Design a protein around this ligand. Sequence first.
Ligand code: MG
Ligand code: ZN
Ligand code: ZN
Ligand code: ZN
Lengths: 229, 168, 58, 51, 171, 84, 507, 97
Amino acid sequence: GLDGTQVERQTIDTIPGSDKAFHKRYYVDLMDEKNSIKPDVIEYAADILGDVELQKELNSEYEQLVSDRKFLREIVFVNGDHNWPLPVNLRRIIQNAQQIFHLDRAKASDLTIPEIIHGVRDLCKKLFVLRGENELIKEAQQNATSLFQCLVRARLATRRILEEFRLNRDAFEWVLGTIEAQFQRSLVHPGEMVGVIAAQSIGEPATQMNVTLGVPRLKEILNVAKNIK
Amino acid sequence: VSTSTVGARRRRAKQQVDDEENATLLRLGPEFALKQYDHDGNEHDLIALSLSESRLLIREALKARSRARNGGVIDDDELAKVTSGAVANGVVKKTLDYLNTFARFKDEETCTAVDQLLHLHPFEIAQLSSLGCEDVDEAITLIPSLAAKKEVNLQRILDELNRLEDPY
Amino acid sequence: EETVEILFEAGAAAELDDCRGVSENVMLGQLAPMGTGAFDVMIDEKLLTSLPADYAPT
Amino acid sequence: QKKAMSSRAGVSQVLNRYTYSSTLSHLRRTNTPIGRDGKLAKPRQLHNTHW
Amino acid sequence: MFFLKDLSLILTLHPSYFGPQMNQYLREKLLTDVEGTCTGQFGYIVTVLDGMNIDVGKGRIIPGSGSAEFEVKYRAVVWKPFKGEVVDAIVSNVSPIGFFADVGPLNVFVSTRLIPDNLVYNPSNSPPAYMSNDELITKGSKVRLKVVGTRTDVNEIYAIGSIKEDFLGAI
Amino acid sequence: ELAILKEERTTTPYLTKYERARILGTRALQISMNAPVLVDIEGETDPLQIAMKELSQRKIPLVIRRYLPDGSYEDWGCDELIVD
Amino acid sequence: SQFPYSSAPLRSVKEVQFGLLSPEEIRAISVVKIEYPEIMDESRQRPREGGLNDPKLGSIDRNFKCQTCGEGMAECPGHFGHMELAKPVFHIGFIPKIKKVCECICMNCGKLLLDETNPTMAQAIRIRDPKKRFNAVWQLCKTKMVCCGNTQPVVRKDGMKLWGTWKKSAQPERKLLTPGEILNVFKHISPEDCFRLGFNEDYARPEWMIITVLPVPPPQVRPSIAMDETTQGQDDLTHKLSDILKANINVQKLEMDGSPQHIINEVEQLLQFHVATYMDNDIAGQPQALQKSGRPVKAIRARLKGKEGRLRGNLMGKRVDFSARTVISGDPNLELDQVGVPISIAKTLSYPETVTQYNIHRLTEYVRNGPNEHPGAKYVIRDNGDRIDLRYHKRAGDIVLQYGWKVERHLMDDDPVLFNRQPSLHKMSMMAHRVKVMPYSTFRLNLSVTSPYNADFDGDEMNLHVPQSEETRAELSQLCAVPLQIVSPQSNKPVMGIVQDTLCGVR
Amino acid sequence: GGLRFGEMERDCMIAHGAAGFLKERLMEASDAFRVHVCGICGLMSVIANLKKNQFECRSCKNKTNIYQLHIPYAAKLLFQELMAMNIAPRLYTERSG
RNA sequence: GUCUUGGGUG
Ligand SMILES: [Mg+2]
Ligand SMILES: [Zn+2]
Ligand SMILES: [Zn+2]
Ligand SMILES: [Zn+2]
């Protein structure tokens, strides 16, 4: 459902690497003292350790990430490619948030884990390619944004948000709102003559161009031939 | 200019004589179909107004539009004035005087009574409310269609009509 | 393509052209149901009646 | 004249007098009447025997 | 005869009029435009039932001109004659070659050849009128007259009747 | 019959590029025909720029009727569609 | 508004319903029967009534009006006549379908060879499309050789003559099927039978594929022209219609006297050939209707097809007013969405600007300036459409501009114009630019836009189109403007980049 | 003369979605014309006398259901040539089915 | 003012 000018190549970070690297990037542990959040980044560091009613949410996050990993590796991208054109550049959003909210001095972050997890969960349920309360509408809406949700969850992970990007609450809310608005701006408009646009986008490159290739092969393809060269 | 729900009437290859008007023989024209429609396309029975229903409707409409003109604040020679244009006032004056020179039912009450009693083809239905007739003869000869329906009831309906007819 | 043959076949079979296409609206010199012409622009009364009473038709 | 179709065209041309070398070249020109109806690139090709 | 009629009138409105009291201006324009007109396909538009309560709906802007189009549909009352329909009247004019009788919004004229021959004209009577043994078609008489002809002229139509048939004429 | 109630309107709440272009053109043409202007005209005299000012302030009194492929349509006032 | 007032409502075409013209309706819509061949009256004024230049057909002259409608050439549409034929003839564009119907039907009593009894045809009837239904009925009904009980012929085509071989029962006596005999057979097909083969009762009746009366187009469709100030040759269609009339009259000179059966066929076939080549002069395996200059006649079909035909040459694309063209030049000092427009072009082209209470001073200064000075104006349009040319108007000082009036001022700075280079391979070959008026005769382009246009400055030329209303101005500036086309959907990357000297210099 | 706004230019305008500009190029910058059609038969056989305000399609014997259409002059010429080859292009201003 | 032919330009 996206306009073809609005998407940019982006890496899906849950796809590549070994399982150990994935686990180290994404898994947080609350009871285990060492493999938890680094204490020197958050105000509430001492309050975190040992909790359970939060380790449940951490496990839910990690299991959703593993579901995305399995889905992308076995159904969508079986050969490992992870750099694909997608709407909304998240690298640029994160760095713009850092610039705007001045994320230096590695200050204690006031951004709690449950709020991060629920913010990303709520965001994933706010990207509307199709509007309607129907049931096939809901199915098509979730099928529409599955890859983009995989991207948004591979980037806005709890460990990544807290350690790698060191966002506070304001930068976090800004990232969510900007993703909302820029995704709503990446959608194709009703009335587009996408057929004429597609015809021109295919025909123009033909003006600049023992397997048959180029113009004769394109001619065989479009003039569907019963035998080929 | 003046159009209505009657639209295409597109051309079939066979043409037809049915456009010939003859009111003795229930031929009126392709504008008064036995089942009308409204401006919402819904089906609706044909209307054929007698002088009584028409007089009530026109009096009501004129006084309503006068009340609309006054902000919310009696005679046909005055009541026809509500229109716009000299030709309009003249036409409506002649129509209202025509109505008040032949309105045997000079109230809404008896019009309602005849509405209940009557409700049969609206042509003759209205013409009975418009044409005083003594016995079966005048009706069945001036309106020749009451013969081939075998539901006449003209005797008693006309009796009660002329009974309810106010003096003059 | 095949303009004359297609028109002859349309005549011989009484084709009805709906005129919902682009080229058909082009050759008749009408606004195509495309892009800016894929919708209609009404005159809004609900927003209009908010105007000052001296801006009225006379 | 009545067989203008099926006759070779352009066998005679208006002499080009724009400049002197254009005239000298027009007087030494040659024409293969293949025609443009046909995409055979072979007769359009510079050949070894052209030397 | 009076017929209730569903009818429409397409209209065009200039942008200069695009104000806060638009709908009532269109209502007045409609009332002025339609109240009195004749059409050969409908009859005569004397009045309109519930005139102030016509719905103008939502108008459409014509692409290229900027004027709004309205399909203001409403149900009105129309009066149309039909050849072979009996219509009452009152005489208006008198003449040796016949007389005029006002029917509905019109005036009907009957010719000399189409009149019972017991009727005799008089240029010298006071009042001048047609007369017979025990009858007088004076001015202001009633006439139950049949229509045997109606020509359709776009603005005003005229019907010439005949009182030559039984149960018809002076009453 | 073909109108849709304001509750089950399932098209985009955002003004598209084509709707914006046509709305601005129509408003500019209207204002150039001495139509009344809803905004306060401060400096600019070009009807297109006045129309843009009206569009930004949600003061264009027009309606977009969005036809669906089945013939039905939805009506949206310009002031309730969202402008980017 | 440049059309005189008509009282009819203005509507748009929602449905096109093709059909054949029925001989009844052809006679009905006509205004004059055409029978006299000769073009002039007698080498004199006011031409022969009932000829191909009947004034009833309409006016193609500037100082004469149409005798059918009372309008001058600026407004008269033209009116059709008719020309009854001595014998019926085939429509050249329907012979294959005439042959197909002949194979399908019973050629004596007018009935389908097979009924709904046979379930194959009983299910072939069930196709909604007339053409698919006709194909499904022809692929079955064409082989049964009996109905009444009369056997069926094997129809065949040899040129324009439809042969039908009757194999009686040995020697199959093969006879020629004339258009009139097929017409008689075809009139007998019943409406439901007609429906089954895929025709229509109201719009397309199978016998209308046989011509019995021929429409004569108005002179607008076949106008004359002027050679040297005193000379005129008729259009090809006119000479073709004259030849058809001669053939018709020669036919009417054979059934009135001696005719030893080898002239009736010949002259009727002359009529058939003239009628065929009046419509289609590209018939395989026969000579072409020729001109005495040796060229073939420009038939109607040849008028309608091709790159230069009506459809592709006059309807899908056409020549337009208010455009300009000249060589392009590069200008480092222009903005990306600016184009430099020569002064002479800025004065030749114009924009009609409605006078309002915000532009009356500027427009009255333009009116005073005149059409030979920039910024000026060329025309003043009054509130009813009357033009006031400001060239020949000697008194340009005595014009007061009314509100609602229109001034056709010059092209000025910041006007949006569509700018274009051929070939237009993609949507970024046509872009909207703001005008900047300049000395010298070339257009000016910022150098970063030469990539989407694929242009350079060694001879190239580009076209400029001026929008003539506020709606088209707004469309250009809000959809086609150069800044809006920087990113392309073809490869979701930019199309304009820093180029040539700025790239080398920035490195 | 004027410049040709050919087929590929139309493709580019269509890609841009500029419908009004395309209609204005092909009509008001070129052979725009006004014709009357019969509301019953849909043929351009209507006899219009504009100064006498009287219209008639003789074939249909019609004088009241007639409409005006603005179409390219080349389209009127195309329909007249089609009529010359016995085809009826019937232009209808409302959809039935 | 029209049709063909020829030489060219991007
Ligand atoms: Mg170049
Ligand atoms: Zn004429
Ligand atoms: Zn048979
Ligand atoms: Zn007609």
